Amino acid sequence: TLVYTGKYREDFEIEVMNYSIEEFREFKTTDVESVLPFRDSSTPTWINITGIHRTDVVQRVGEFFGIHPLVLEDILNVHQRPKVEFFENYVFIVLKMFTYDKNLHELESEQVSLILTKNCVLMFQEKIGDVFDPVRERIRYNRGIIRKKRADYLLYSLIDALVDDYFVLLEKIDDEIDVLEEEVLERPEKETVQRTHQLKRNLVELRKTIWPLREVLSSLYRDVPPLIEKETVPYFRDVYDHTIQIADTVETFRDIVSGLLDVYLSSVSNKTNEVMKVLTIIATIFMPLTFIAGIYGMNFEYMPELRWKWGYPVVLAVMGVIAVIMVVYFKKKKWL
Amino acid sequence: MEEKRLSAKKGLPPGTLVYTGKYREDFEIEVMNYSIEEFREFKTTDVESVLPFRDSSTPTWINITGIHRTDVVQRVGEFFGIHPLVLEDILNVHQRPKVEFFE
């Protein structure tokens, strides 16, 4: 019983990258049948599964690799905080990817899952396009120490790429925060309040995502399972430090946004007073005119207006005089 | 929360210590070396003139103003045998008051 919770079902893809000291094989595939042998290879291998909405593929991979049904359900579940579980035959980490889009004020998320099994690393994504391109290029072009190392270093590299993209998202949010502060100080316009609320919601989501991430990485380096070599423990430690940075930044950012609300939020009763005053001003000067128009417009078959020449100019002047008196009264007593 | 090791920021080279505050205008070292019957007050701008006061028998009060100059802080910490993490904490203004007991 495996069900898929998210809303991404557009595409499915698979690709294997088996790299060694001097030879690499990068095979793009369309079905799981090719990646079945990649369990007993001596060299590090990276399996990439895109579009897990086809639950059959992940079920087959988990059955072949011995992945527990519960953690398979965790893989399928898309609304879950990042978390790490250490098992004897593999270590299972699940993390979040973010993609802020400018000119839209919206934050999009995605769930990615890494499974380290001795000589291989499985990656489960949900859409075409990711943030692990630099690792791919470094493996392809032999532009680092990645080839010389095992699959645990691959896990380190992928988490490092995730943290770097977190930093990029932080840069984007920094630009948004600066422009929003300028707008709110210059002119607290109505759309700016909605923008600030959306920014606050995005920062709350980002905090609630990042904070379990540093716990995951702490569990990664501080108490290494036998799968992670003690030689690669310091590198993981570095990544932990980086998340610290992110967290602090987010916290600072959140603080700022809170201020951006209160400075606007409490000073609203002034708007209530202005609306009260406008309504009273244009209701206290026009109800009397309507009433006098009614009484002198009242039909009676008789009136003190049988001839009464120039009476209509008299009543128009009465209207004008009353209006002028009320205007002067409010000007002098300051309801305007 | 176990063991003390230098934190690694990703925007900096691995060992560099950075000043965090927003003041660069001042720098001055005031040494005040007193005793029961004497005291020497000595205001300077050379870091190398305060080093002999580490081994002074009498009490001495060194006051370095302008920690924005990280080289002076690093030199004083290196001479007085101060741990590099304590130096990073010294230069890190954005932190709460704290106390650490070392040997």
Partner: antibody, heavy 126, light 108 residues
Framework: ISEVQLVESGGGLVQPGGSLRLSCAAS????????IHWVRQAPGKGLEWVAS????????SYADSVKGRFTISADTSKNTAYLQMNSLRAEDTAVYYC???????????????????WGQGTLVTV | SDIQMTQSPSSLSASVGDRVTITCRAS??????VAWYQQKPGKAPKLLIY???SLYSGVPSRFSGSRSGTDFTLTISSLQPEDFATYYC?????????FGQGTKVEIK
């Protein structure tokens, strides 16, 4: 009282594909505690960053234009920074400046690097 | 790839006592790691402003820097005869520092 300054030498006429070793001797401060940058200024054009060395850890950054052929290093014994230029080009003729920088803090994640002291400059013609 | 800073105008002109504004646009997002330098013709560049708002110690307070999103402005409130030089941007968000085009300030 040290009168911080950077005196730079090594700029002379060379042939394309030739080799040069620009030297930047820094007086008034220690190279180990600061970052040293090199910058070009082609005659009539603007400033162009070239290389950067942090002698404390040897971490090195190069401009993409000169990457692969230039090499910046620093010796703390002589308190000097050397820029070795190989496989030069006729478009590389410029006035080279040596600069000292200090890192400053913007946010917990973001840092900034500002050059406060500069050298005189040396002409290198190819 | 590389963050590119573009300055406007490429050159301007003014008289002593005027107010001068130079604008600088970054292709990508640099948080506040932008610095403004002044270079007189034939001399080494001089640091004026760092972090887009802070001003280096020893420069007159007439120089001011501001940022709005990605746009960065350097403003001389009351230009003085010793302020007719070429002004440059710099971004140090990444290890690959890049400089702006450079705007000359002629005298009219």
């Amino acid at each position: 009282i040290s009168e911080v300054q950077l005196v730079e030498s090594g700029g002379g006429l060379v042939q394309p594909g030739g080799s040069l070793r620009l030297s930047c001797a820094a007086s008034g401060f220690n190279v180990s505690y600061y970052s040293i940058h090199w910058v070009r200024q082609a005659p009539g054009k603007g400033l162009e960053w070239v290389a950067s060395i942090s002698s404390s850890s040897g971490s090195t950054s190069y401009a993409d234009s000169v990457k692969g052929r230039f090499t910046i290093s620093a010796d703390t014994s002589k308190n000097t920074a050397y820029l070795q230029m190989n496989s030069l080009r006729a478009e590389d003729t410029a006035v080279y400046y040596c600069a000292r920088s200090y890192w400053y803090y913007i946010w917990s994640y973001s840092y900034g690097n500002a050059m406060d002291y500069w050298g005189q400059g040396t002409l290198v013609t190819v | 790839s590389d963050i590119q800073m573009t300055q406007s105008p490429s050159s301007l002109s003014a008289s002593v006592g005027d107010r001068v504004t130079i604008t600088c646009r970054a292709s990508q997002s640099v948080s506040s790691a932008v610095a403004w330098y002044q270079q007189k013709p034939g001399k080494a560049p001089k640091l004026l402003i760092y972090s887009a708002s802070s001003l280096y110690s020893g420069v007159p307070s007439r120089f001011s820097g501001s940022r709005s999103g990605t746009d960065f402005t350097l403003t001389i409130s009351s230009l003085q005869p010793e302020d007719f030089a070429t002004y440059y941007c710099q971004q140090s968000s990444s290890s690959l520092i890049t400089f702006g085009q450079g705007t000359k300030v002629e005298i009219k």
